[PDB]
Amino acid sequence: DKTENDIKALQSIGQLIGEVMKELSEEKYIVKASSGPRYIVGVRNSVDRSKLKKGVRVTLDITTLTIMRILPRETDPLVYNMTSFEQ
Amino acid sequence: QLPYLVANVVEVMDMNEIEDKENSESTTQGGNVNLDNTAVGKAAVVKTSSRQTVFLPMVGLVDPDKLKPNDLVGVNKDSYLILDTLPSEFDSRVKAMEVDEKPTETYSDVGGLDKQIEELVEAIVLPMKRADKFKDMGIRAPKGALMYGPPGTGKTLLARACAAQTNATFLKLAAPQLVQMYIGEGAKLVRDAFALAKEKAPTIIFIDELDAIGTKRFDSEKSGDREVQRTMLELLNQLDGFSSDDRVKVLAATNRVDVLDPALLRSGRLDRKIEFPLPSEDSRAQILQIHSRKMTTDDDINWQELARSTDEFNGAQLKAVTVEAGMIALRNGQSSVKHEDFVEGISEVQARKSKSVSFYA
Amino acid sequence: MQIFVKTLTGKTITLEVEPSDTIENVKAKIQDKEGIPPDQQRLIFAGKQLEDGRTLSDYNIQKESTLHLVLRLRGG
Amino acid sequence: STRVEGSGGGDSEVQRTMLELLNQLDGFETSKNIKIIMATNRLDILDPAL
Amino acid sequence: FAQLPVGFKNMGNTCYLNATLQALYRVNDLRDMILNYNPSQGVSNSGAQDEEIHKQIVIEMKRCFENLQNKSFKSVLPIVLLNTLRKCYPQFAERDSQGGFYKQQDAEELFTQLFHSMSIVFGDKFSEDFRIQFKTTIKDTANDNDITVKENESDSKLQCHISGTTNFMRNGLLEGLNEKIEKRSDLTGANSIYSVEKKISRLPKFLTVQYVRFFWKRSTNKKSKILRKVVFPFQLDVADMLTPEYAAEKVKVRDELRKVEKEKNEKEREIKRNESEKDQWLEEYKKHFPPNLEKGENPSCVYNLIGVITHQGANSESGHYQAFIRDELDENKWYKFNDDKVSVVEKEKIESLAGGGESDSALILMYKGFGL
Amino acid sequence: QEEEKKQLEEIRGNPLSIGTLEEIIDDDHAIVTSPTMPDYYVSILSFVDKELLEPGCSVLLHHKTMSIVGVLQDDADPMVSVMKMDKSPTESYSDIGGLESQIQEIKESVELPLTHPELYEEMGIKPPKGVILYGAPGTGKTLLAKAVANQTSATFLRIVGSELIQKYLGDGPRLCRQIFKVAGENAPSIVFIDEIDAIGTKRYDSNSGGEREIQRTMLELLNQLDGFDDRGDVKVIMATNKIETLDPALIRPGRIDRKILF
Amino acid sequence: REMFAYAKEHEPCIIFMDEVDAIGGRRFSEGTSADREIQRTLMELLTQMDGFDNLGQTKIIMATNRPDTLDPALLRPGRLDRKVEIPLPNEAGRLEIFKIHTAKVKKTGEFDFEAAVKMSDGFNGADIRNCATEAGFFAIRDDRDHINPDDLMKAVRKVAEVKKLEGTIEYQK
Amino acid sequence: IIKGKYVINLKQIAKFVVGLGERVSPTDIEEGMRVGVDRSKYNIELPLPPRIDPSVTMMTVEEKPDVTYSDVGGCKDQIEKLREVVELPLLSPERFATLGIDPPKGILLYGPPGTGKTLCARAVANRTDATFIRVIGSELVQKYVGEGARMVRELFEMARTKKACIIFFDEIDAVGGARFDDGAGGDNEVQRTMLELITQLDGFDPRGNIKVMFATNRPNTLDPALLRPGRIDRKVEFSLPDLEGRANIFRIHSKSMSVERGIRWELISRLCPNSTGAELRSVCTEAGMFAIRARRKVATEKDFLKAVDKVISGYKKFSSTSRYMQYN
Numbered sequence A: 001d002k003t004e005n006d007i008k009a010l011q012s013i014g015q016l017i018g019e020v021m022k023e024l025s026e027e028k029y030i031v032k033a034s035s036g037p038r039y040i041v042g043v044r045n046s047v048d049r050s051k052l053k054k055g056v057r058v059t060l061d062i063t064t065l066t067i068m069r070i071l072p073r074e075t076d077p078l079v080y081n082m083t084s085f086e087q
Numbered sequence B: 001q002l003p004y005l006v007a008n009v010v011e012v013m014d015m016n017e018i019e020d021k022e023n024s025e026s027t028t029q030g031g032n033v034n035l036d037n038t039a040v041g042k043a044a045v046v047k048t049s050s051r052q053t054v055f056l057p058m059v060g061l062v063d064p065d066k067l068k069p070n071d072l073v074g075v076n077k078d079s080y081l082i083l084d085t086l087p088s089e090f091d092s093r094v095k096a097m098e099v100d101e102k103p104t105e106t107y108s109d110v111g112g113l114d115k116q117i118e119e120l121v122e123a124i125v126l127p128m129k130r131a132d133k134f135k136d137m138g139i140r141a142p143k144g145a146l147m148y149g150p151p152g153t154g155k156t157l158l159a160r161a162c163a164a165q166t167n168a169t170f171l172k173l174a175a176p177q178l179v180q181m182y183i184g185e186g187a188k189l190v191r192d193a194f195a196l197a198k199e200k201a202p203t204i205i206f207i208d209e210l211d212a213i214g215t216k217r218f219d220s221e222k223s224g225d226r227e228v229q230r231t232m233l234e235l236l237n238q239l240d241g242f243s244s245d246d247r248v249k250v251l252a253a254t255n256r257v258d259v260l261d262p263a264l265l266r267s268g269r270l271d272r273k274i275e276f277p278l279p280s281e282d283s284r285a286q287i288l289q290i291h292s293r294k295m296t297t298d299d300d301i302n303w304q305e306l307a308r309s310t311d312e313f314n315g316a317q318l319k320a321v322t323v324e325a326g327m328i329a330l331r332n333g334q335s336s337v338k339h340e341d342f343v344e345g346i347s348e349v350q351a352r353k354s355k356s357v358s359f360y361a
Numbered sequence C: 001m002q003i004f005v006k007t008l009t010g011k012t013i014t015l016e017v018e019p020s021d022t023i024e025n026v027k028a029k030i031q032d033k034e035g036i037p038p039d040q041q042r043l044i045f046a047g048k049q050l051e052d053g054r055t056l057s058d059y060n061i062q063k064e065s066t067l068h069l070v071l072r073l074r075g076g
Numbered sequence D: 001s002t003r004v005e006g007s008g009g010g011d012s013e014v015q016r017t018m019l020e021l022l023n024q025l026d027g028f029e030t031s032k033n034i035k036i037i038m039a040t041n042r043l044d045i046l047d048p049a050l
Numbered sequence E: 001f002a003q004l005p006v007g008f009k010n011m012g013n014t015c016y017l018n019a020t021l022q023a024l025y026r027v028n029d030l031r032d033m034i035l036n037y038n039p040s041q042g043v044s045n046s047g048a049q050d051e052e053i054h055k056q057i058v059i060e061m062k063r064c065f066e067n068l069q070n071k072s073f074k075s076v077l078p079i080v081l082l083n084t085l086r087k088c089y090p091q092f093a094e095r096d097s098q099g100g101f102y103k104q105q106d107a108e109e110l111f112t113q114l115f116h117s118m119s120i121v122f123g124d125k126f127s128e129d130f131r132i133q134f135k136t137t138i139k140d141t142a143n144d145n146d147i148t149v150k151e152n153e154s155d156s157k158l159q160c161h162i163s164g165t166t167n168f169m170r171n172g173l174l175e176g177l178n179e180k181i182e183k184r185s186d187l188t189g190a191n192s193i194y195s196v197e198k199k200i201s202r203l204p205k206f207l208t209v210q211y212v213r214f215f216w217k218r219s220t221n222k223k224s225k226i227l228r229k230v231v232f233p234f235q236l237d238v239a240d241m242l243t244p245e246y247a248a249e250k251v252k253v254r255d256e257l258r259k260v261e262k263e264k265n266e267k268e269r270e271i272k273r274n275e276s277e278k279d280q281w282l283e284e285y286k287k288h289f290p291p292n293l294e295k296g297e298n299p300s301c302v303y304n305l306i307g308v309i310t311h312q313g314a315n316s317e318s319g320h321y322q323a324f325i326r327d328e329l330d331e332n333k334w335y336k337f338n339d340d341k342v343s344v345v346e347k348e349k350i351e352s353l354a355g356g357g358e359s360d361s362a363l364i365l366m367y368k369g370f371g372l
Numbered sequence F: 001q002e003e004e005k006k007q008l009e010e011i012r013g014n015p016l017s018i019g020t021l022e023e024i025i026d027d028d029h030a031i032v033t034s035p036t037m038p039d040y041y042v043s044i045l046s047f048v049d050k051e052l053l054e055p056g057c058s059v060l061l062h063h064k065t066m067s068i069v070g071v072l073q074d075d076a077d078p079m080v081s082v083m084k085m086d087k088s089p090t091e092s093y094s095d096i097g098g099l100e101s102q103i104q105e106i107k108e109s110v111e112l113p114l115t116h117p118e119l120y121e122e123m124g125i126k127p128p129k130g131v132i133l134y135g136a137p138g139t140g141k142t143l144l145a146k147a148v149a150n151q152t153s154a155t156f157l158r159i160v161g162s163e164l165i166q167k168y169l170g171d172g173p174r175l176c177r178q179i180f181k182v183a184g185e186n187a188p189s190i191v192f193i194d195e196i197d198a199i200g201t202k203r204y205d206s207n208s209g210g211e212r213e214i215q216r217t218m219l220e221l222l223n224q225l226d227g228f229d230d231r232g233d234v235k236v237i238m239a240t241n242k243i244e245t246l247d248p249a250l251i252r253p254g255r256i257d258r259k260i261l262f
Numbered sequence G: 001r002e003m004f005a006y007a008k009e010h011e012p013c014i015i016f017m018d019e020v021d022a023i024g025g026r027r028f029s030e031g032t033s034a035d036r037e038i039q040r041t042l043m044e045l046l047t048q049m050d051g052f053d054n055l056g057q058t059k060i061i062m063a064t065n066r067p068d069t070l071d072p073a074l075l076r077p078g079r080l081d082r083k084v085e086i087p088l089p090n091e092a093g094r095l096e097i098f099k100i101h102t103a104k105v106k107k108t109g110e111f112d113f114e115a116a117v118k119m120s121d122g123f124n125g126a127d128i129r130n131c132a133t134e135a136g137f138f139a140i141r142d143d144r145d146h147i148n149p150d151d152l153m154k155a156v157r158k159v160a161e162v163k164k165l166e167g168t169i170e171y172q173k
Numbered sequence H: 001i002i003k004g005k006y007v008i009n010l011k012q013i014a015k016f017v018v019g020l021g022e023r024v025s026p027t028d029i030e031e032g033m034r035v036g037v038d039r040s041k042y043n044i045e046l047p048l049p050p051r052i053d054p055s056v057t058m059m060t061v062e063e064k065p066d067v068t069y070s071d072v073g074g075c076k077d078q079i080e081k082l083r084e085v086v087e088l089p090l091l092s093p094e095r096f097a098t099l100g101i102d103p104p105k106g107i108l109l110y111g112p113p114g115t116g117k118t119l120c121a122r123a124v125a126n127r128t129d130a131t132f133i134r135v136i137g138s139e140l141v142q143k144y145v146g147e148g149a150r151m152v153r154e155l156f157e158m159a160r161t162k163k164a165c166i167i168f169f170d171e172i173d174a175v176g177g178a179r180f181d182d183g184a185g186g187d188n189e190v191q192r193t194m195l196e197l198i199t200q201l202d203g204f205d206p207r208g209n210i211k212v213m214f215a216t217n218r219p220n221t222l223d224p225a226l227l228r229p230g231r232i233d234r235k236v237e238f239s240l241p242d243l244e245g246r247a248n249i250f251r252i253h254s255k256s257m258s259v260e261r262g263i264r265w266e267l268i269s270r271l272c273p274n275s276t277g278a279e280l281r282s283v284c285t286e287a288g289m290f291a292i293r294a295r296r297k298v299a300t301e302k303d304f305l306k307a308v309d310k311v312i313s314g315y316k317k318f319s320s321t322s323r324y325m326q327y328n
């Protein structure tokens, strides 16, 4: 099972994060990526319109660029080092 | 096998394992009952050195007790999945601070000025090794010991001699090199010089020349000394106690003790303050005899007579007498250093020709 | 017969062989324990090469001797 | 504020370079076309090379 | 216009021979003996029928060298010699698939085989000229219970074994003439670690040192080539690898010769503002050579650099050897032999061949005895 | 012509990716850093003569695999734009006429060794190098410099001395160091520094100018005038009238041979 | 920007800026290009604190090593409502600090602090803790695991001698 | 280095773990060393010399000027002091192993202007056959402070890898001068390179066969931590010519000049005050311009007198005729 779980991750692919910059139309969303350049991208029926608001991180695929799911916010690798000072 | 990218873990957010009826994610999914529909396993977000972040289902083979929001990992380039964990990165200039079979110079290259040595051993070496007694005593560790006094006194040479002699790890670091105009990553040279050191502890960070990051000023106007001090403050951050300065130490040599920062006057930064004097009567004679140990000498010499005609010279000036004795011997056409030529090397080099034409003095 | 073979990494290992045995046996035995293939091996003694068709008594090769092993390289 | 004690103005340094090119720039295609029209509150703050 | 020697035109897949020959002919006794060959030179008789093939090879060098010295010529043929070598050793006579023609390997091996042939023809007395004799003490680590002294161990060149111990040639020579032998034999114990120190007991009059560049990677199971920077001094002193006794003898002669060498280097520059002048100095030099000198021995412990074989490009499995030799008339003037492309290069070009990288780097260094 | 281009284009592009040459290696290789980004470990086709190129050159790389097809020679910078002439004087000599009794120490050390090397062969030793002109203004110095240039037909650079003062620090010496390397590249040049008393009175702000900026540029110009370099023939013309704001290492005779009073 | 956002995601997040001097400094901009990063970052702080974002949950502690090093917008209270002075200790305020560090040490009992500490003046609070450390260097000299009054009165005296090296004169408003 | 693969930074910055191919061994890769890797799959293809930052440490390296040692500047005993510190341990370390002393390396060339300090390091550049690296101290300062710190370190460690070289620190009165603290100044950025000069020279080991000459044209601008003589061994003041030394210098110039012999070179030294060695170098060239007016091939006795007067009135008009920039 330790290697079966690795198979399942391996035959999958990564996601590339964006956030909803501006709603354009029903099935078209404008995002500004965390890597930069803005796109227009689509949605599956794996997400709702009432479940998206702006500044909410969204997944995209790196082979079709379509949102499948809602993603929690991000927060610096740097600011986690500050919470580890308490001594 | 190769290739595989090197990355850091932004954060871990963790989705549920596949054992529920309603998704295996912490987030909510458009559409209900799903368990393998569009809901995925445990998750970590990592930042690639191709400069993006990728949200991946992390490999079940890599235990999630290995991931930290600040840890360096392998990622398979072709399809981005954590392959493995790897130790943390260090910058190339920081990897050569280490020893590589550093030679020792031990106390056999030092004659005269024993008191200095004693203070150094007590400050640095023994709180490392006798670190239990220190807790018994009920006091906090030293963050470093300062060395100061005029140029040529012997500071640098001590530092090397003792660190190699006792086998405490000697990091070779020079102050201006931390000042870089990459600042933020050049300030991260400072951060990594402590990062290496906390793994390589106990360790001695010998910073040679402490008047670049030991500047008096931190009120500067309309100049680029406001770039300079931002690598000074990061050092003072890693000498504030969130430990990682409790066995990680600092030696510092400085030639000017007039411009040291007020946040380095205070103890908790540099604690022990070692003065290096002008040598006494007896001490000068010992110093000469250490340089003369290596070379041939005649047995008609007397170091006390030589110490009369030297008036409170320090150690650089005395090295320049012992080598100049043997300059003269080659020049006459011998190879035996005459006992008379010490006398002529004192006058030949004082680090000054004559005392500058007298006409009313 | 015990002989010594100085490898490419300049460390001496021993080898157990015979003075009647051919150089092809000598090289086969180094193949078993290091992995090096005979046709890239060159066993030297006295500054003179010991070819595959030679043995270990043609040049008076007895025990407590060290052969110096160096490797081939192609081109022209 | 130390360039007006330092050079008569830091803009007078650029003006002074300009004017010296123009002393022998009378022919480049043969005749002058590009004139240097300088202007200031009063001309007591100008450099003696202007 | 000006006098310059001729080179070999590479047939292709032949440079391993062409490159090596040039370096050898710089050596003063080498070129002499091939010229003054008679079919009456005493052989090391114990029988053997390949003594006769060795004779034929030495004739081929003689005529190659006659072609080389004389200008009625711009190319020296290796073809008759190639045919003799392929008869002699049937490893060069195979056939590559998808590449082509006659098997190509190995300037090191080739110098070894050439000296073997010459020593049969010109006797064991000629063998001593490049041959080095050691004093080997094989002795346990701690107290000795088993000891053997070998002088019958011998070589005709040094093997500088790189293991990442080189930044200078001397270090790696010193750690490959120093070694630990592990045993697999029964004593009254077994697997005793012996310290072995070989020291030179007889200097050659001509020194060769080869860098070892190859490795068998065992972690991938494929041949790689070591790449490293090793500075080689033009003026090589082997004092520390001799025993105290032998070092004492050669270092005292060396210091007097360095006085006369200094005196020449001053006089040369003045008269500027040649062969005969060197001979007037030679007659002065030979007077400080020891009266106990023997055959096949340098009168000093110092050697000067007359050849570098460089190997360029990618992997081993591939190679086009060009070479550098020093002029026979000069001392800081070097000829680059890139097959038949012969050119003058300087000291700076020789210095650059320390290597590391896909660039030219050293495999073989030829020196010779007598400082100057 | 027909057979030459067939086998020339076989390795020469279509697009020829530009590189900048960092360093060569002596095995017929180099390591380039491209202005586009990626470095490359390039070979060299080597019909451009391996020893004919050197760091700072702009190089032609091949678009299949990056090999040095060739090397471009002749560049221009925004820093030699300032130096180069944008006119050719239209007032030629003796439009400075009058005060012509000490024009004989500027037409027999500046013009002449170029015109006759013959007369300086008879005496042999070093020719005259340099003049400094000084006097009150209105003695024609600035055009005199541009008029002896007409006669010799040697590359005349002209640089103003208020452009050797910059409002940034450390990059001043770097600009001045350039000026003479350009000049020696032309085998004959004349460099006129207009107002070399404008590097010892002029400053911008005091935290990137000040005494220090002035001080450094004087010291730099010593090495350029002579120092170690041993460059080609540059005749130098300096016009100044404040000759006490300079190093006492340039206004000594033995560098700027005759000094002329007007 | 993301640090103030994070503080709003995390009730009662308290932010210590440690050693601000040259990341919240003045306009400067006649030196390096580095000085324009200072501004850029400095605006960020004020826009979070005040605008259509206002913090009452969530607190700022600004620690600076010399008061007059900062931009005047950081000298404008309303983001920074209190400018609290923490003194260099008083005569008998040194006694207060000495008593907390004499419970960190192992000792044989000491209650003779007051006279010596009152007139050993010249100390900041970290030098009380370094007088502890120097008494533990005197202690190791005598071969002790303990602090005694024979260590103590030498400790305050020594640390005083070495602090004559240079002083600290900085304006206190 | 990860011990048994390595972490590289591409120059496209992107980091990768790479292995070992078939041209590379276990021991070929070092810290901060460059390696070339393959673009389809990242693996060490060819090891490479360290550090691509060098390009302006290569504009201070040039090959040697071949000026003779038979025409030099200053005809005193001052150049033989150079021949014991700089020149001889490069030629022969054998004598300094017999003495048993740590060989002598450093020397200061300091004193009056115009005394041919650069002429003797060019003269030595022909003779020793040792690579010369010549430095301008004023090219070491950059607008963006911290850049020249990098610069110095890179040159000096690279030079320990070279063998038998001389580094001529020229014009280091800027960086290498005085040190002082300001309150709102802008001098401090420059001092960074000053500090880096102290710490590379002294090292954490001593110089690996680097003989150092420092040319200061004022003996009044030197860091007080190179003023100490332990790293700058015997230091020889190049001063203005003596009354016998000027006669010698003028004789080298006039053997090289086409003249009529029967001209006193001693007389010419008398008319002169004590003054630079460069004045006598311009007596001949002005006597050469009087040759052409006179219509000669030679310079004769008379016109040297005119030339001598020209330069002397020049020094009267200026200064540094007995100045040291104040205070020997």
Ligand SMILES: Nc1ncnc2c1ncn2[C@@H]1O[C@H](COP(=O)(O)OP(=O)(O)OP(=O)(O)O)[C@@H](O)[C@H]1O
Binding pocket: B109, B110, B111, B112, B113, B150, B151, B152, B153, B154, B155, B156, B157, B158, B253, B254, B255, B286, B287, B290, B291, B315, B316, B319, H198, H202, H225, H226, H230
């Ligand atoms: N007590 C001593 N005995 C023998 N030699 C000494 C002694 N003190 C100093 N020296 C010699 O004087 C030299 C100069 O001192 P050193 O350079 O080590 O210290 P420093 O004061 O940090 O100088 P800098 O900062 O200028 O490098 C030493 O390297 C050593 O050769």
Ligand SMILES: Nc1ncnc2c1ncn2[C@@H]1O[C@H](COP(=O)(O)OP(=O)(O)OP(=O)(O)O)[C@@H](O)[C@H]1O
Binding pocket: D023, F095, F096, F097, F098, F099, F136, F137, F138, F139, F140, F141, F142, F143, F144, F239
């Ligand atoms: N003595 C002169 N005889 C003839 N024309 C002169 C004289 N002096 C100056 N001029 C003329 O004045 C104009 C500018 O002079 P130029 O700039 O060449 O001289 P300068 O001596 O460098 O200083 P300035 O410009 O301050 O006069 C030109 O038209 C030039 O011909």
Ligand SMILES: Nc1ncnc2c1ncn2[C@@H]1O[C@H](COP(=O)(O)OP(=O)(O)OP(=O)(O)O)[C@@H](O)[C@H]1O
Binding pocket: F222, F226, F227, F248, F249, F254, F255, H072, H073, H074, H112, H113, H114, H115, H116, H117, H118, H119, H215, H216, H217, H249, H277, H278, H281
């Ligand atoms: N002693 C001398 N003998 C002959 N010529 C000299 C002498 N001194 C100086 N010169 C001439 O002066 C020219 C420039 O001098 P150089 O550049 O060596 O200056 P320097 O003596 O190092 O002084 P500074 O540091 O003040 O610039 C030389 O090329 C040379 O022709």
Ligand SMILES: [Mg+2]
Binding pocket: B156, B208, B209, B253, H202
């Ligand atoms: Mg030091």
Ligand SMILES: [Mg+2]
Binding pocket: B236, B240
């Ligand atoms: Mg703090």
Ligand SMILES: [Mg+2]
Binding pocket: F137, F138, F142
């Ligand atoms: Mg004018």
Ligand SMILES: [Mg+2]
Binding pocket: F219, H171, H172, H173, H215, H216, H217, H218
């Ligand atoms: Mg100078």
